[PDB]
């Protein structure tokens, strides 16, 4: 329902020419739905996250079934990027290997000692110029 409200708010066009398609108002522009902490959503009593299943369905099959008319809605100019944490982090739960297939994973670690030194060294030299 969170994603449905997000699409209703920003992707007003629910047009259905020769098929129901979902597109944002700003024509010629794509849309990136930045989903943060995607692996926090709890799984059901039977180990299955609902929103993860929804994303897999609307990414692999490229659309969903709206509950208003039970009609297939196809995504237009919509893409998803998620931000999550290692599974061993307490409070975190792994995703289904079925969802992972459509999404490549990139591992961003904490900046190293020299990296932190140079990154914040530029900040300190900018600040002390006052």
């Amino acid at each position: 329902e969170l994603l449905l409200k997000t699409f209703d708010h920003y992707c007003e066009y629910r047009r259905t020419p020769n098929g129901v398609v979902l597109a944002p108002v700003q024509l010629g522009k794509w849309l990136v739905l930045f989903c943060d902490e995607i692996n926090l959503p709890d799984m059901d009593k039977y180990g299955t996250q609902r929103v993860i299943s929804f994303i897999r369905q609307m990414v692999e099959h490229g659309g969903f079934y709206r509950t208003s008319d039970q009609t297939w809605v196809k995504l237009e100019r919509i893409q998803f990027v998620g931000a999550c944490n290692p599974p061993t982090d307490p409070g975190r739960k792994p995703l289904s290997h079925r969802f992972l297939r459509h999404v490549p994973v990139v591992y961003v670690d904490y900046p190293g000692p020299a990296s932190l030194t140079q990154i914040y060294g530029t900040f300190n030299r900018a600040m002390l110029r006052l």
């Binding site: 059901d44 039977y46 180990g47 299955t48 609902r50 299943s53 929804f54 897999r56 369905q57 099959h61 969903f64 079934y65 509950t67 039970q70 290692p86 599974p87 792994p94 995703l95 289904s96 290997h97 079925r98 992972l100 297939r101 459509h102 999404v103 490549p104 994973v105 990139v106 591992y107 670690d109 140079q118 530029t122 900040f123 030299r125 900018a126 600040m127 110029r129 006052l130």
Partner: protein, 942 residues
């Protein structure tokens, strides 16, 4: 309220004359609404079966008084076996009723619509005339079968003439009546007889008529007559066994329990037309036969357990209690209950109970059962909430109170309404103890029902009989071989979540064996002839049903067991080349790899052929295998191949169950307005059933691509079992059309109960089925087409360059296996890494296109292109197989790539490869040259 009346007061012409004063005074609110509801309930009370029909359907039916043809759809759900009614040429006089299998029951006395114009009255009369016609035809059939009862060496021709003369239920009834009368007469003649044994004549008569049937089933027979014969052997073999038991136990008088325990029938047409000629009797339990056209349905092989079940249900009905069969799944509970409800010839309705059945729904169902007197089998009753089980304990105590009041037109309290109760009522609740998604029953309700343990069905006799009936001359040996084979397969094989070796498995095997035998008879005749090898037919059926679900380490075990139980014979896969050429064509059209046997893409073709086999056998299918095993493509390519091979279109609706709430999946029923809104699956099923756009002529394939858990799939237990029926809390019953397959593409069945595993033919898509070279070839084929003409050429020659690196044991495969040997934050999935790699190579082609566009003169040449692509491929391997890992894992993958490659690499010895990018000209440039040491402004820092 007001909107309801506004919507419903502007319909057809005569539909508005149904108490039209409200219609005129509309074009206050509570009075009008309650008057309309009172009219609806009055019409429902006039004809009790109207408590099964919807209010809108009833109102349209009354509005469609002149048109009767449009009313020929509700008969399927009003009655049990009635699906059509035969009218006169002028659409004015109904002559009889037709079942959905094409069987006619011509009324002895026709009734005219003009001679009773009101819908309810003429419907009541046609019901009564149907019962009267069944009674009269049963009397005639009993009179006819008297001749076979008092004759030896019976004539097969006249015997078949009798069999196809009358309806199937009447034939079985006549057989049972004749046997009961003969055994009773023999026992009476013996009395206290020291040595008189005239019942051996009865046994010999059963033997000879059974031999006549066995001879008659071995040859070509018409379909309806074939089913009648099958039923008749199933009953007569039980009669033979009962008579042998009586002879062995040496019963003298007809009052002994060894004869009283077995069901016996008593016919006397002397009494009046109150339809009490039949007096079916179990042990001290007298039952009438509520004559109603059941049509033609399957008959179970009355086994030792199926008898005990009959005894306990009859005793419970005598005590006016209910029956609560319990035990493991697929042990003959809903089918034994139904078979007994049809032995007494009474309308039985099966409801699949779930937590959405609220109190008012149960009350409405019980009111319908009161008015009609029809039985009720509530499948999976414990699936209701415990609170609701307690709540309906009150209604069970009220309904049983009305039956106990009959013992002293009875009314019982059911939803602040007093309803007529008929003694033929029955309430049955099948349940699965100790199963996931099941709630415990209160003791208050558990004392209102009588329970028996249907734990282990007698599958040996179940097989031997169903075979003997098919035409297998060595049915005894076949069953003696196959049942121990099943019990040893259950133990020897490794335990898996999708493994089912119960009665539902044996049943599917024996049905397939019968179909295979019929097909082999046809094939032989295309070139009496009963020297077939039956063992190889059984092996073919087993291998066409059991094999498609074995894991790669279990097939040798099953084949060894088969070769040990059946030593000397073996089966070879059917060629099915007429389908395989179509599969090759459509795979070529879909950039998917095709093979045969040990070729590349051969195991996947074997699995799609097995999926076709399971589609032919079962009506519910289930694909089990690790994600990325080719499950989705298997059924897509099969559907596209069948829509050309057979010419019938195939439309597939893919529904994700867990994506949406099960309220949206099936439907909702608001407790206030009492209005039903179809869910997702229900809407699709209603569209299919109502073939307005020819949906019944298309190969509809509903697929549930998601996760199976014992909450939603349990609502489908009635659609995936022999019932082929969807039962809703509204009371609506939607039959599954024969051209519909319910499929479930899952990765594992760990969170699933044996009930759903028992149905839905399993197809196990192992991970080795989709080989990595097939995925590579799919990519290269998609790259050599599908322009992301100039851009297409840029993709073509790039694919030509990358072809040597995608060998089965090429660079990419070795890098992938080494990456699987490393450690990643998330578990490494092959198709994820391959998808990222393919996306990045597509981006490499876009970079080439961008560069070619940027330099219209001096276009980017072949040597530069091959250098750039062969370096970008290494870059992509490193950033796909180790983009999810920590830095030293990336370095390890880089070192492995360096030592197992021939592509030129950066020459620096210390800095890892990942720190290098690939320039558009094709040089391994460092990334530390694109990190300017910038100076942030003195403001806006951080």
């Amino acid at each position: 309220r007001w909107v309801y009346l506004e919507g419903i007061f502007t319909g057809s012409a005569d539909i508005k004359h149904l108490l039209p004063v409200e219609t005129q005074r509309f074009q206050l609110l509570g009075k009008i609404q309650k008057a309309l509801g009172e009219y609806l309930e009055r019409e429902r009370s006039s004809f009790p079966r109207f408590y099964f029909v919807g209010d809108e359907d009833l109102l349209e039916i009354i509005g469609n008084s002149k048109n009767v043809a449009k009313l020929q759809k509700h008969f399927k759900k009003m009655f049990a076996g009635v699906s059509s009614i035969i009218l006169n040429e002028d659409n004015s006089v109904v002559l009889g009723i037709s079942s959905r299998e094409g069987e006619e029951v011509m009324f002895k006395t026709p009734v005219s619509i003009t001679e009773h114009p009101k819908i309810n009255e003429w419907l009541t009369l046609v019901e009564k005339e149907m019962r009267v016609t069944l009674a009269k035809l049963l009397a005639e059939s009993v009179t006819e079968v008297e001749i076979f009862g008092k004759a030896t060496s019976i004539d097969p021709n006249t015997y078949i003439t009798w069999i196809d003369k009358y309806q199937a239920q009447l034939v079985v009834l006549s057989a049972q009546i004749a046997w009961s009368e003969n055994v009773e007469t023999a026992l009476s003649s013996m009395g206290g007889g020291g040595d008189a044994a005239p019942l051996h004549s009865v046994l010999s008569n059963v033997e000879v008529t059974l031999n006549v049937l066995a001879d008659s089933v071995l040859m070509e027979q018409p379909p309806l007559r074939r089913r009648k014969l099958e039923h008749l052997i199933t009953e007569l073999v039980h009669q033979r066994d009962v008579t042998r038991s009586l002879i062995k136990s040496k019963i003298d008088n007809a009052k002994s329990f060894e004869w009283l325990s077995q069901m016996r029938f008593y016919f006397d047409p002397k009494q009046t037309d109150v339809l009490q000629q039949l007096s079916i009797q179990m042990a001290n339990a007298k039952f009438n036969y509520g004559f109603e056209y059941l049509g033609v349905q399957d008959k179970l092989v009355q086994t030792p357990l199926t008898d005990r079940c009959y005894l306990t249900m009859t005793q419970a009905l005598e005590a006016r209690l209910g029956g609560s069969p319990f035990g493991p799944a697929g042990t003959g509970k809903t089918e034994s209950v139904k078979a007994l409800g049809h032995q007494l010839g009474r309308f039985v309705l099966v409801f699949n109970c779930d937590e959405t059945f609220d109190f008012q729904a149960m009350g409405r169902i019980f009111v319908g059962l009161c008015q009609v007197g029809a039985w009720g089998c509530f499948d999976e009753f414990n699936r209701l909430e415990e609170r609701m089980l307690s709540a309906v304990s009150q209604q069970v105590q009220c309904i049983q109170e009305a039956l106990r009041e009959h013992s002293n037109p009875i009314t019982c309290e059911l939803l602040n309404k007093q309803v007529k109760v008929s003694p033929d009522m029955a309430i049955f609740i099948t349940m699965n103890p100790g199963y996931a998604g099941r709630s415990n029953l209160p003791d208050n309700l558990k004392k209102l029902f009588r329970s028996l343990a249907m734990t282990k069905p007698d599958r040996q006799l179940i097989a031997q009989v169903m075979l003997y009936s098919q035409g297998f001359r060595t049915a005894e040996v076949l069953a003696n071989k196959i049942v121990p084979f099943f019990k040893l397969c259950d133990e020897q094989l490794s335990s898996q979540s999708h493994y089912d070796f119960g009665l539902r498995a044996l049943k599917s095997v024996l049905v397939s064996a019968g179909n295979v035998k019929r097909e082999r008879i046809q094939k032989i005749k295309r070139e009496i002839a009963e020297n077939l090898p039956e063992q190889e037919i059984l092996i073919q059926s087993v291998c066409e049903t059991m094999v498609p679900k074995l894991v790669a380490e279990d097939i040798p075990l099953l084949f060894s067991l088969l070769s040990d139980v059946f030593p000397g014979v073996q089966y070879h896969r059917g060629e099915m080349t007429a389908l395989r050429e179509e599969l090759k064509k459509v795979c070529q059209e879909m950039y998917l790899t095709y093979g045969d046997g040990e070729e590349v893409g051969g195991m996947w073709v074997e699995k799609v052929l097995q999926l076709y086999q399971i589609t032919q056998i079962n009506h519910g299918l289930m694909m089990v295998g690790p994600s990325g095993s080719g499950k989705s493509m298997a059924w897509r390519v099969l559907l596209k191949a069948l829509e050309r091979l057979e010419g019938v279109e195939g439309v597939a609706h893919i529904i994700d169950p867990k994506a949406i709430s099960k309220d949206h999946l099936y439907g909702t029923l608001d407790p206030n307005t009492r209005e039903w809104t179809d869910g997702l699956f229900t809407h699709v099923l209603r569209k299919i059933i109502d073939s307005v756009r020819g949906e019944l002529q298309k190969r509809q394939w509903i697929v549930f691509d998601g996760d199976v858990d014992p909450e939603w799939v349990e609502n489908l237990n009635s659609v995936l079992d022999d019932n082929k029926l969807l039962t809703l809390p509204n009371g609506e019953r939607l039959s599954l059309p024969p051209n519909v397959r319910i499929m479930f593409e899952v990765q594992d069945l760990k969170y699933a109960t044996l009930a759903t595993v028992s149905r839905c033919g399993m197809v196990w898509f192992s991970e080795d089925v989709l080989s990595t070279d097939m995925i590579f070839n799919n990519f290269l084929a998609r790259l050599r087409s599908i322009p992301l003409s100039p851009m297409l050429q840029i993709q073509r020659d790039a694919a030509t360059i990358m072809q040597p690196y995608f060998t089965s044991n090429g660079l990419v495969t070795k890098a992938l296996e080494h990456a699987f040997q490393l450690e990643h934050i998330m578990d490494l999935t092959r198709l994820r890494c391959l998808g990222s790699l393919f996306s990045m190579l597509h981006q490499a082609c876009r970079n080439v296109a961008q560069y070619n566009a940027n330099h219209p003169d001096f276009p980017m040449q072949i040597e530069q292109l091959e250098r750039y692509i062969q370096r970008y491929l290494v870059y992509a391997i490193l950033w796909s197989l180790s983009g999810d890992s920590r830095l030293k894992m990336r370095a390890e993958l880089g070192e492995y790539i360096r030592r197992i490659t021939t592509v030129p690499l950066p020459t620096a010895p210390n800095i890892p490869i990942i720190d290098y990018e690939v320039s558009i000209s094709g040089e391994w440039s460092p990334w530390q040259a694109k990190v300017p040491q910038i100076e942030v402004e003195t403001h806006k820092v951080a």
